[PDB]
PDB file of C-alpha atoms in Angstrom:
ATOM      1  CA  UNK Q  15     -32.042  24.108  -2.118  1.00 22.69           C
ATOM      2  CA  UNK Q  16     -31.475  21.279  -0.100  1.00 20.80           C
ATOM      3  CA  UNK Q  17     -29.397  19.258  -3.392  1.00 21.37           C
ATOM      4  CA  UNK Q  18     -25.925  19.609  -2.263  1.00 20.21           C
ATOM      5  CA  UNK Q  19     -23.885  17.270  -0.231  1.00 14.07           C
ATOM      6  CA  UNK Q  20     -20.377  18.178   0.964  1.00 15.92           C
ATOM      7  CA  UNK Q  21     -17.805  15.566   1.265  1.00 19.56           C
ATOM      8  CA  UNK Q  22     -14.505  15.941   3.123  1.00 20.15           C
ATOM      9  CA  UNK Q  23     -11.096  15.480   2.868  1.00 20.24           C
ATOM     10  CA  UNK Q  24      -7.771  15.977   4.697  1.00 22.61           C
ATOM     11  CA  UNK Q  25      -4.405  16.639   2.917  1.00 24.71           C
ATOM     12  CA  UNK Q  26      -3.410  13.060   2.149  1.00 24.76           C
ATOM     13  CA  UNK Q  27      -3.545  10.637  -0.963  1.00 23.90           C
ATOM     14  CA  UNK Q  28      -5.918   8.096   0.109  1.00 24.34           C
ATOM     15  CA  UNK Q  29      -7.992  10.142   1.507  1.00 26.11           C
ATOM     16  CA  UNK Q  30      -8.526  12.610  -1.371  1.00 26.59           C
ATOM     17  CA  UNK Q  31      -8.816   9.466  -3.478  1.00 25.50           C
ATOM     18  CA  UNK Q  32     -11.667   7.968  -1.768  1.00 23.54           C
ATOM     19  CA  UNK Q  33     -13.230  11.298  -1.179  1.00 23.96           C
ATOM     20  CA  UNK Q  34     -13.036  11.719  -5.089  1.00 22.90           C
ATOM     21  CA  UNK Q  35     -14.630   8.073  -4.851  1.00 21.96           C
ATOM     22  CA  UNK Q  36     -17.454   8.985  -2.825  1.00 22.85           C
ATOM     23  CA  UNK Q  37     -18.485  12.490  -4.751  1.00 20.12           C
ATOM     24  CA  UNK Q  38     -18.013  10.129  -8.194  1.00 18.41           C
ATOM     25  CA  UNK Q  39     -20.715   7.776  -7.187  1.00 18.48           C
ATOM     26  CA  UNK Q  40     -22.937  10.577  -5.963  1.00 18.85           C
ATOM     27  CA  UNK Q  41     -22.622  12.134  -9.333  1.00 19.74           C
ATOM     28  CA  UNK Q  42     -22.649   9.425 -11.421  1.00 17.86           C
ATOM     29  CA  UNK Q  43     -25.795   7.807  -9.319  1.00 18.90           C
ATOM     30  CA  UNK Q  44     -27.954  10.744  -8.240  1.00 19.67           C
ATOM     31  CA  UNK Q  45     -29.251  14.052  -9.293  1.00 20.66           C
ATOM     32  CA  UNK Q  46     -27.051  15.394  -5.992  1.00 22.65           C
ATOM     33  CA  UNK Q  47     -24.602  18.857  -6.558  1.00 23.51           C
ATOM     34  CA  UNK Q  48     -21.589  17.561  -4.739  1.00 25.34           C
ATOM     35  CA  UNK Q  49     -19.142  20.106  -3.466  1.00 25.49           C
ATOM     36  CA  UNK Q  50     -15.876  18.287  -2.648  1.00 26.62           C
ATOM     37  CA  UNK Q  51     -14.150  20.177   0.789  1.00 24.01           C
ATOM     38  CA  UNK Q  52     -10.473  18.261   0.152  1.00 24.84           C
ATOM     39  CA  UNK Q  53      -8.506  20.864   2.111  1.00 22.77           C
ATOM     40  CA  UNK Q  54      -9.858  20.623   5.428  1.00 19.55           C
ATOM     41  CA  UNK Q  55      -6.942  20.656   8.349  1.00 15.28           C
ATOM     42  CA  UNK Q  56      -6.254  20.307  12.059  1.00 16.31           C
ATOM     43  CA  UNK Q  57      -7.369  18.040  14.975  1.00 17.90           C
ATOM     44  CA  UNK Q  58      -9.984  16.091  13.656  1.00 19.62           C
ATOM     45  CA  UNK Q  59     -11.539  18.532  11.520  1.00 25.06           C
ATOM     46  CA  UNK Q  60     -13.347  16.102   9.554  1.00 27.58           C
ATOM     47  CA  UNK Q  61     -15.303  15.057  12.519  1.00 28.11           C
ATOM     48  CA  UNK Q  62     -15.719  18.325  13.796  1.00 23.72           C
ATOM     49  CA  UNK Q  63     -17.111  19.375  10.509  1.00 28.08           C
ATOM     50  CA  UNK Q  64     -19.356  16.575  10.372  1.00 29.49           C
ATOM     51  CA  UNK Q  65     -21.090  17.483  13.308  1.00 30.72           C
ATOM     52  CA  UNK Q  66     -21.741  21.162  11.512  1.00 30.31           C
ATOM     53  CA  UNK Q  67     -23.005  19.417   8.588  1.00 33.11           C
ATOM     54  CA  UNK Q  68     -22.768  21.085   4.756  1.00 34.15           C
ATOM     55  CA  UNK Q  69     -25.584  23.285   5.652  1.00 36.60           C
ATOM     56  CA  UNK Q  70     -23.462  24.980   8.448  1.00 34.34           C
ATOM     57  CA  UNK Q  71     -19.770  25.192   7.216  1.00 35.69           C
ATOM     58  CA  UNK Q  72     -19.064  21.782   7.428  1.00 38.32           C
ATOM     59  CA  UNK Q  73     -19.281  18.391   5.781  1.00 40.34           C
ATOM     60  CA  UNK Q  74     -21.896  15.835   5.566  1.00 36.09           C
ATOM     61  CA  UNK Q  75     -19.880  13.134   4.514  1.00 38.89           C
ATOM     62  CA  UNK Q  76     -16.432  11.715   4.430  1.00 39.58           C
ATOM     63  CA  UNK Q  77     -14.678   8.592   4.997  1.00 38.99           C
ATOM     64  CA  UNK Q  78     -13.045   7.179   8.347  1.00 34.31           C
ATOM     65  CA  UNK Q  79     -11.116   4.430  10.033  1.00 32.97           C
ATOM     66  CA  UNK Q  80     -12.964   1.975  12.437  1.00 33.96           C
ATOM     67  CA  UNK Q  81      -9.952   2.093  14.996  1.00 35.79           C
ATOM     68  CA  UNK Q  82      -9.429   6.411  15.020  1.00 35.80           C
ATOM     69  CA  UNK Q  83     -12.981   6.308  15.692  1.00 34.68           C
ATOM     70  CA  UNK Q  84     -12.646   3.829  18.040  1.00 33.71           C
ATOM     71  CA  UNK Q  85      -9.777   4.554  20.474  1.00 36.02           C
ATOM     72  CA  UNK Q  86      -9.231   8.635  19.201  1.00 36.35           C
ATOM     73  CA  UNK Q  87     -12.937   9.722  19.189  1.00 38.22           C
ATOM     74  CA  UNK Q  88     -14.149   7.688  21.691  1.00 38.57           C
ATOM     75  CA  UNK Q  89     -11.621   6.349  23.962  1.00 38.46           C
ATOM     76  CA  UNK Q  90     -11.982   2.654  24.090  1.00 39.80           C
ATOM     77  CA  UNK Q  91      -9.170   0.059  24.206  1.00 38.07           C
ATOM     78  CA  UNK Q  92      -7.524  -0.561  20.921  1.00 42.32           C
ATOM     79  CA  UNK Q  93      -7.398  -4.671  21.030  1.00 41.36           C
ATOM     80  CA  UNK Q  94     -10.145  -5.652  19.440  1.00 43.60           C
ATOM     81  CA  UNK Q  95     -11.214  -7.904  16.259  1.00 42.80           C
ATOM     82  CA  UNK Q  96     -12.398  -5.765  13.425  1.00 47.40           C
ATOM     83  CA  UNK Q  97     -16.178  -6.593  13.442  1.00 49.37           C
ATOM     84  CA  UNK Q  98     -15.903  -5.727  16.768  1.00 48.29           C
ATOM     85  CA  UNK Q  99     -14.580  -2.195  16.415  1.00 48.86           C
ATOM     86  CA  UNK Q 100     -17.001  -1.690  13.113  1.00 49.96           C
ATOM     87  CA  UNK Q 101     -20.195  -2.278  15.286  1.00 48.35           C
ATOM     88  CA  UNK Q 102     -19.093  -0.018  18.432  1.00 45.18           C
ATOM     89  CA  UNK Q 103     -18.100   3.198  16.357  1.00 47.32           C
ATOM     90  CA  UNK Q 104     -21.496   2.343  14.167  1.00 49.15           C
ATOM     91  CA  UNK Q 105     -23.490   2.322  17.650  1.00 49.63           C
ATOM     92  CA  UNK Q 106     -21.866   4.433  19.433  1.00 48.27           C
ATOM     93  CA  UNK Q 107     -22.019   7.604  16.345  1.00 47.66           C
ATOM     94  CA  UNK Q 108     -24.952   7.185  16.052  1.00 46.45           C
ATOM     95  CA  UNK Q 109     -26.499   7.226  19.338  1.00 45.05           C
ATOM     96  CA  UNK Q 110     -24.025   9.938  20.540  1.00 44.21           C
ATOM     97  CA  UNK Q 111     -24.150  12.184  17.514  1.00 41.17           C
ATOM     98  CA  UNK Q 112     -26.334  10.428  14.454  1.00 39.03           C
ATOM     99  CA  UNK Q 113     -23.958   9.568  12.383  1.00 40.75           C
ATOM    100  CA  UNK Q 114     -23.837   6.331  10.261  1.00 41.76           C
ATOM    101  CA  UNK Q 115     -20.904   4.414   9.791  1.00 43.52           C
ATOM    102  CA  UNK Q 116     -21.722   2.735   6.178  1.00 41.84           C
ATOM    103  CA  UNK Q 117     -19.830  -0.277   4.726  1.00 42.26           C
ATOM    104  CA  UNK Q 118     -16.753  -0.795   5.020  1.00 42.33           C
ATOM    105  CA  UNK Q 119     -14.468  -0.373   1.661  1.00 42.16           C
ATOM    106  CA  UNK Q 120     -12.590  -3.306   2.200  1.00 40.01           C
ATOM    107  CA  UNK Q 121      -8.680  -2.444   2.822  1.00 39.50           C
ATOM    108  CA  UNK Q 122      -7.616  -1.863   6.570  1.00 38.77           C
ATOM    109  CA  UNK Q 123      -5.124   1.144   6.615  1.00 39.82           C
ATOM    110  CA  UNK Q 124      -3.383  -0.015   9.792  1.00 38.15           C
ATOM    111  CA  UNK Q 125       0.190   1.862  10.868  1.00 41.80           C
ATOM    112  CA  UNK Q 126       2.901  -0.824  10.263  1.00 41.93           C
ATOM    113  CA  UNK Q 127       6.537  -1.439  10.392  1.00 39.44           C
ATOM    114  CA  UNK Q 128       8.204  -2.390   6.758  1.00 41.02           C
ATOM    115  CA  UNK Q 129      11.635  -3.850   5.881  1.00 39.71           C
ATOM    116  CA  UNK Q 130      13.236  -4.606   2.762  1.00 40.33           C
ATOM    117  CA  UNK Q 131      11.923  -7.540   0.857  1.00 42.25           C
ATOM    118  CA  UNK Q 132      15.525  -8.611   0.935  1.00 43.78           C
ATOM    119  CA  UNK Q 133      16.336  -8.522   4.356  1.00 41.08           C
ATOM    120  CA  UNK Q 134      13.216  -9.822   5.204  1.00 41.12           C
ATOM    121  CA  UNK Q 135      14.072 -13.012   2.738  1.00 41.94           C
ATOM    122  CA  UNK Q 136      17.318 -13.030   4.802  1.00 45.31           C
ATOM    123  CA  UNK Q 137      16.086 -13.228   7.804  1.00 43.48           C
ATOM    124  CA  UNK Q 138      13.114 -15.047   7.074  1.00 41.13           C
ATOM    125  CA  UNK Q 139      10.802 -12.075   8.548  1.00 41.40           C
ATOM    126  CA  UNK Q 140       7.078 -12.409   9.146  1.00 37.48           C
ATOM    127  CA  UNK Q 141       6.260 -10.889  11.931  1.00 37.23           C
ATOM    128  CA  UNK Q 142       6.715  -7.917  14.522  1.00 36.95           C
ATOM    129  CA  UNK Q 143       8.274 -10.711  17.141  1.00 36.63           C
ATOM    130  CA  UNK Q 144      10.283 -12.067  14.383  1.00 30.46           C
ATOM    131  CA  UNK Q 145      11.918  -8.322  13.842  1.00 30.69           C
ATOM    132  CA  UNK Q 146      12.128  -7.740  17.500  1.00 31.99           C
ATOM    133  CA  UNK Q 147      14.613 -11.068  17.566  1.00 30.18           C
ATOM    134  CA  UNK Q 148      17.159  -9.305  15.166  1.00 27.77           C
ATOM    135  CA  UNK Q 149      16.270  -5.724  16.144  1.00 29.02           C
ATOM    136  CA  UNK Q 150      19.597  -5.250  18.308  1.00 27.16           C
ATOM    137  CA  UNK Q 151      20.915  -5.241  14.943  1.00 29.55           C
ATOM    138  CA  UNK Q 152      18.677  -2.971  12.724  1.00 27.98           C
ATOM    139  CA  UNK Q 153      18.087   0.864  12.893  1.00 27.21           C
ATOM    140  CA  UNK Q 154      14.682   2.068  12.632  1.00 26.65           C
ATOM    141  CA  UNK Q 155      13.868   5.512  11.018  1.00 26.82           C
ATOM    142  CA  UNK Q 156      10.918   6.350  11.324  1.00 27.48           C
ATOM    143  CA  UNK Q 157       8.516   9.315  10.925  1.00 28.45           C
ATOM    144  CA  UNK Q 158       8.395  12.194  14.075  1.00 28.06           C
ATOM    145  CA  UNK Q 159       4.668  11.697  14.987  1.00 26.65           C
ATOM    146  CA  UNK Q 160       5.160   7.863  15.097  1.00 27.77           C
ATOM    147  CA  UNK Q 161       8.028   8.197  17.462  1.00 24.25           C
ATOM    148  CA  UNK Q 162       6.098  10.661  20.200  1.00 25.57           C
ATOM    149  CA  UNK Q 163       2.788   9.004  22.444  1.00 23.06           C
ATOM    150  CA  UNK Q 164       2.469   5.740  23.739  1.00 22.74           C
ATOM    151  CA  UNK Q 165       0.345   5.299  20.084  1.00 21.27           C
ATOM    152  CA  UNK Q 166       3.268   5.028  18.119  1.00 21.86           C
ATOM    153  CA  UNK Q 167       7.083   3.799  18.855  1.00 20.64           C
ATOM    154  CA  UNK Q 168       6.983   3.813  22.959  1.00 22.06           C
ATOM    155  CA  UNK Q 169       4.469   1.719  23.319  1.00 23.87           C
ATOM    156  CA  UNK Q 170       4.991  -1.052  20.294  1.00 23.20           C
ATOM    157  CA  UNK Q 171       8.690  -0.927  21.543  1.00 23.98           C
ATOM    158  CA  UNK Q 172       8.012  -1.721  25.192  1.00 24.89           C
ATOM    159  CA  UNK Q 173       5.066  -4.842  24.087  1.00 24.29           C
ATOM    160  CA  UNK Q 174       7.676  -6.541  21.789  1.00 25.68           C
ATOM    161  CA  UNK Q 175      11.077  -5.545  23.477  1.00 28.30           C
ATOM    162  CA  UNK Q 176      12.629  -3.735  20.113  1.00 26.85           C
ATOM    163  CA  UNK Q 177      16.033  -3.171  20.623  1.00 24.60           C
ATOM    164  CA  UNK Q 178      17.156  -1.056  17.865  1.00 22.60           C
ATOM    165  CA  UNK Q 179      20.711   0.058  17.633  1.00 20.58           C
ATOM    166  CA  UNK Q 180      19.442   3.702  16.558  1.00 19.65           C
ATOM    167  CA  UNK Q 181      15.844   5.356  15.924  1.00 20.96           C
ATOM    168  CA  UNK Q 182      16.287   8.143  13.464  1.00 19.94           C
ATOM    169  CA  UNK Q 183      13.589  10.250  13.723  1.00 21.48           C
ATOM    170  CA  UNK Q 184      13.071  11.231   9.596  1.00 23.91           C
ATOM    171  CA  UNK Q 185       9.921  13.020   7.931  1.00 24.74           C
ATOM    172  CA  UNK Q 186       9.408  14.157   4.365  1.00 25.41           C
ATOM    173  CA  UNK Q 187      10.937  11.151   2.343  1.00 25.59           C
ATOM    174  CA  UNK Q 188      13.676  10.917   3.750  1.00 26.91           C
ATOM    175  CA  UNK Q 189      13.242   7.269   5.183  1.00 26.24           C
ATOM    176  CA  UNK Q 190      12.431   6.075   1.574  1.00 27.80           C
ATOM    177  CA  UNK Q 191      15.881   7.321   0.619  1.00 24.84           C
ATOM    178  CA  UNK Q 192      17.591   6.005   3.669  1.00 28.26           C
ATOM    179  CA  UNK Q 193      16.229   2.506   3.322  1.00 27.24           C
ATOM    180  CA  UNK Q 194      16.873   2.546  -0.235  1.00 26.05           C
ATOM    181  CA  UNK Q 195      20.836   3.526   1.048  1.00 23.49           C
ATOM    182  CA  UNK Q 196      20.747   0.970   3.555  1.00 23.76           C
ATOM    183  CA  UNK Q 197      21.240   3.975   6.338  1.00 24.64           C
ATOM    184  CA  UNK Q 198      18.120   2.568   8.125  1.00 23.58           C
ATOM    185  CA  UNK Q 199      16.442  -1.377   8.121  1.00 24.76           C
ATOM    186  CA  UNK Q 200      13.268  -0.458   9.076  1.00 28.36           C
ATOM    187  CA  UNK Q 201      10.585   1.978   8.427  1.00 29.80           C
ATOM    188  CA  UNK Q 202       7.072   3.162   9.939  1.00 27.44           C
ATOM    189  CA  UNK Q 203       4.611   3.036   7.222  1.00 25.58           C
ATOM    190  CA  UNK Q 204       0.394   3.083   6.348  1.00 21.87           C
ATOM    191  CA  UNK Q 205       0.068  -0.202   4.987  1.00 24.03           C
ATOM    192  CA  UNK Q 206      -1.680   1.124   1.798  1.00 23.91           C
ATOM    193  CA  UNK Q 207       1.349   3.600   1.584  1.00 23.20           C
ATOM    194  CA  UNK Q 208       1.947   4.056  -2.065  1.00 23.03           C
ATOM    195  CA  UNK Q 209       5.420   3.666  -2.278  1.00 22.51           C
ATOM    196  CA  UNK Q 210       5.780   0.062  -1.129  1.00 19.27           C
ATOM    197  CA  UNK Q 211       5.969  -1.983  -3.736  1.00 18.93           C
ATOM    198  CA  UNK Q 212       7.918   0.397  -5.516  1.00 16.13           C
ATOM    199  CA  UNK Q 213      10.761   0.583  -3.135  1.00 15.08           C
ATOM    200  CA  UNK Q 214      10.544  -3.569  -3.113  1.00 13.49           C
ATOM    201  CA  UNK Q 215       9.283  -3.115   1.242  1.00 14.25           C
ATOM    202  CA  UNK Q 216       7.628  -5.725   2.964  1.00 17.45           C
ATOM    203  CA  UNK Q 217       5.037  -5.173   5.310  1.00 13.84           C
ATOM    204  CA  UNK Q 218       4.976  -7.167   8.702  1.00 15.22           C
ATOM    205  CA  UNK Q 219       2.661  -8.849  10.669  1.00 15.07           C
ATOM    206  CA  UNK Q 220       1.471  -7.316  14.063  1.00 16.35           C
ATOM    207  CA  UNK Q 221       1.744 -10.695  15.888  1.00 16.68           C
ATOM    208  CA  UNK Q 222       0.440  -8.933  19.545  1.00 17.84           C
ATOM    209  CA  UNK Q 223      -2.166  -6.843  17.613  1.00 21.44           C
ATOM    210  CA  UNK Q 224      -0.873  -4.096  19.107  1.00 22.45           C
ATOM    211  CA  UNK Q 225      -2.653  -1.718  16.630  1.00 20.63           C
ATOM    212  CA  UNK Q 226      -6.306  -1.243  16.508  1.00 20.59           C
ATOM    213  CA  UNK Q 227      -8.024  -2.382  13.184  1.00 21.30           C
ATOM    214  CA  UNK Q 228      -8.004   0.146  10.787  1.00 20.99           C
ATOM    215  CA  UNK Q 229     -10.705   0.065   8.375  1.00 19.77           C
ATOM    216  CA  UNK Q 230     -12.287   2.581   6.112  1.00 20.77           C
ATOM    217  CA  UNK Q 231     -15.834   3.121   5.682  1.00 21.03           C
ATOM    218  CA  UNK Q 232     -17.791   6.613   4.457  1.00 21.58           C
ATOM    219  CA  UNK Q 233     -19.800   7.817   7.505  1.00 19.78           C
ATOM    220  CA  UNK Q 234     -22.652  10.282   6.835  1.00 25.11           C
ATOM    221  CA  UNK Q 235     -24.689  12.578   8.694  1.00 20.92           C
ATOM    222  CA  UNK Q 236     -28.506  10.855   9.327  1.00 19.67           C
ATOM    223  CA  UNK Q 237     -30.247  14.010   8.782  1.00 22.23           C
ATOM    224  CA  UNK Q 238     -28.401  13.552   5.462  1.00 26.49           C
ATOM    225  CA  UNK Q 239     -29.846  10.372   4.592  1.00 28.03           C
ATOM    226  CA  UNK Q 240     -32.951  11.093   5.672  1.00 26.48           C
ATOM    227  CA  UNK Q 241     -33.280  14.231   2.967  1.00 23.00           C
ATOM    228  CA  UNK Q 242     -31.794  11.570   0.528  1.00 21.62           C
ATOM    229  CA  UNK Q 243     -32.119   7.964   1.609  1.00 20.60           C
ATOM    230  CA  UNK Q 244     -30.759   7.178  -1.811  1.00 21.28           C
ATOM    231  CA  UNK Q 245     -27.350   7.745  -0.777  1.00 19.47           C
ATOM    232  CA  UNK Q 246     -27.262   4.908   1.703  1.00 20.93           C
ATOM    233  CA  UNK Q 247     -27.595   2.461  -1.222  1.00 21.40           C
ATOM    234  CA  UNK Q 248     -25.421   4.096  -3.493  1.00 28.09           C
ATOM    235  CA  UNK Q 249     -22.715   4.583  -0.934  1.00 28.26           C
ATOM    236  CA  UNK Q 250     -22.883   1.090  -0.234  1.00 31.39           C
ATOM    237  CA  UNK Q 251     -22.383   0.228  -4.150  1.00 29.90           C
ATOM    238  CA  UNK Q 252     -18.107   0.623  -2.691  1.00 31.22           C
ATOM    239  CA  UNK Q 253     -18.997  -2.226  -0.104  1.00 31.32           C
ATOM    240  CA  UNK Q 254     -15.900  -4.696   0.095  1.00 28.55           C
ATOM    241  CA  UNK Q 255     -14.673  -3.086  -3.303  1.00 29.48           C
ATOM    242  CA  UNK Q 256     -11.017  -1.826  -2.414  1.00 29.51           C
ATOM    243  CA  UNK Q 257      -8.775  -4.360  -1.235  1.00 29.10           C
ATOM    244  CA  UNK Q 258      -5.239  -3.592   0.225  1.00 29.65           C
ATOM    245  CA  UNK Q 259      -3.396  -4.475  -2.738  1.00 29.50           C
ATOM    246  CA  UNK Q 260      -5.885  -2.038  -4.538  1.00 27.69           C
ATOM    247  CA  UNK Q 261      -5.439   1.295  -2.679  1.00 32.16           C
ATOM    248  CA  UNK Q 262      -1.988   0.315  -2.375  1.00 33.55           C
ATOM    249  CA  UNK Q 263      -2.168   0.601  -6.621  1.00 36.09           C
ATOM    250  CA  UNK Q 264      -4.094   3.702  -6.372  1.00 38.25           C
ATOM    251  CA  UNK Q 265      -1.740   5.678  -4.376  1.00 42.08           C
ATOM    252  CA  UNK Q 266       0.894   4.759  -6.108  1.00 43.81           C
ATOM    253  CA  UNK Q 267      -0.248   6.187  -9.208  1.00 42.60           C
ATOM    254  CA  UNK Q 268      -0.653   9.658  -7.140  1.00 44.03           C
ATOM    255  CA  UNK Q 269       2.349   9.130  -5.196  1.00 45.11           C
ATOM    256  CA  UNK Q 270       4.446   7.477  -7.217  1.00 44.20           C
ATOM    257  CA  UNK Q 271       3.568   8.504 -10.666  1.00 40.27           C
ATOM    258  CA  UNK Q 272       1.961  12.293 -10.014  1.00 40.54           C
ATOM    259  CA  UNK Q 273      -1.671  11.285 -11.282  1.00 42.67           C
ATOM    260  CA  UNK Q 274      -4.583  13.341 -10.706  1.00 44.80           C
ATOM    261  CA  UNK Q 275      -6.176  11.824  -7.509  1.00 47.78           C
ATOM    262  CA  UNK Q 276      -9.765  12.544  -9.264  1.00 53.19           C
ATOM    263  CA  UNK Q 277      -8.846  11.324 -12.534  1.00 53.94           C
ATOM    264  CA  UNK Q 278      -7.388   8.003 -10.564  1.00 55.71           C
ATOM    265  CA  UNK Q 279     -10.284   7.713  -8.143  1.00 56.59           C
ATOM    266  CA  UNK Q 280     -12.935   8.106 -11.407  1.00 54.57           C
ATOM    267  CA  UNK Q 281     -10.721   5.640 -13.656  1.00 55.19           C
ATOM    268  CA  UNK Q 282     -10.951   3.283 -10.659  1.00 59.67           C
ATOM    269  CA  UNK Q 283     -14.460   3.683 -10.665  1.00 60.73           C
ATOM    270  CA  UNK Q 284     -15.532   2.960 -14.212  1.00 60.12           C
ATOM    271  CA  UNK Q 285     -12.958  -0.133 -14.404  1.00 61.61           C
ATOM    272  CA  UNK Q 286     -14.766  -1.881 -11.300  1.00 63.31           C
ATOM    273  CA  UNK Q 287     -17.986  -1.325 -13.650  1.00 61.59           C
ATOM    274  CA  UNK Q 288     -19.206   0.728 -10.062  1.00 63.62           C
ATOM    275  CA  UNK Q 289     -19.737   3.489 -12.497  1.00 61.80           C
ATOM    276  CA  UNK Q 290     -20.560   3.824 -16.431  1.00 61.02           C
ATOM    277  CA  UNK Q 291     -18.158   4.030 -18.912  1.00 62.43           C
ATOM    278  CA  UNK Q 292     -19.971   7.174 -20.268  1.00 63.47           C
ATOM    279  CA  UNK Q 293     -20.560   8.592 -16.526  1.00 62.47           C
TER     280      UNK Q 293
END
């Protein structure tokens, strides 16, 4: 034995795209069985399966965001540059539980607050200050987990001062439709969330940097690498390869346009030449 490598995956677009990603350039690169463990739920289940490993019911592989690993896993302040929170989760994983943080993918995934490119034109919106001016005027409607915990709405609201008239607590899609209707102004979003551009939503700018930096990288079990030291190379082949604007693209076609997320993560693949046409 000893050919397999699991990667993981919660139940959410990105992440089951760049999962697919991951076990693509394993395939395509390696003589590696992949087994692809896209289902995996709960409190950080990804980590807690990493530390199990493939060999013990878990996962030896999947891909994470510098600032959950920062402030969620290991509990330091969330106001820091990006290189900065890349090089303490890289340390600290891998002194407390040897894991390597690999390169980062390129796109930071950060929580954000989006308004209508119109309104936003209006208004002449840039920024999460800029809102916070005009927010006596604006309702907000925004998802139930972003509105709970001093993470989310409580404590953005009390660093800028947003006075919205109403906060609508909405889940499902139901903020999509209620921007769209003008019932709400503003909406919580990820700012690779694939329905952005579609529904003509700007993103703004988090002025106080009130949210951590937010970008992904694969992280992999050492034991891992040293069975296959390959992998570190080919892993890093998706260095600096995804921008914003192209995970943004990606979940749209899942999100948007009900593509396979394998199909889109392997067409993806072969059109940045990061895989062979034939592979």
């Amino acid at each position: 034995a000893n050919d397999t490598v699991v990667v993981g995956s919660i139940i959410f677009t990105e992440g089951i795209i760049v999962a697919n990603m991951v076990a693509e350039m394993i395939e395509a690169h390696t003589d590696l069985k992949v087994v692809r463990k896209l289902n995996l739920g709960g409190v950080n289940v990804n980590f807690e399966a990493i530390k199990r490993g493939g060999a013990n019911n878990g996962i030896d592989i999947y891909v994470e965001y510098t600032g959950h690993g920062l402030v969620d896993i290991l509990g330091f302040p969330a106001t820091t540059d990006p290189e900065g929170a890349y090089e303490t989760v890289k340390k600290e994983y891998k002194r407390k539980w040897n894991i390597v943080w690999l390169k980062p993918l390129g796109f930071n995934n950060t929580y954000t607050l989006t308004v209508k490119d119109e309104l936003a034109k209006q208004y002449n919106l840039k920024t999460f200050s800029d809102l916070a001016k005009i927010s006596d005027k604006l309702i907000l409607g925004a998802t139930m987990f972003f509105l709970e915990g001093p993470d989310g709405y409580p404590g953005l609201q009390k660093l800028y001062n947003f006075k919205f008239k109403h906060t609508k607590s909405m889940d499902m899609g139901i903020r999509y439709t209620a921007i769209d209707n003008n019932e709400v102004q503003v909406i919580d979003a990820w700012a690779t969330d694939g329905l952005l551009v579609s529904h003509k939503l700007k993103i703004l700018e988090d002025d106080k940097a009130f949210f951590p930096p937010y970008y992904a990288a694969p992280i992999i079990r050492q034991d891992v690498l040293d069975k296959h030291p390959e992998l570190k190379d080919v892993l890093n082949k998706l260095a600096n390869q995804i921008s914003l604007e192209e995970m943004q693209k990606l979940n749209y076609k899942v999100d948007g346009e009900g593509q396979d997320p394998a199909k889109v993560a392997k067409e993806f693949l072969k059109e940045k030449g990061l895989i062979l046409q034939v592979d």
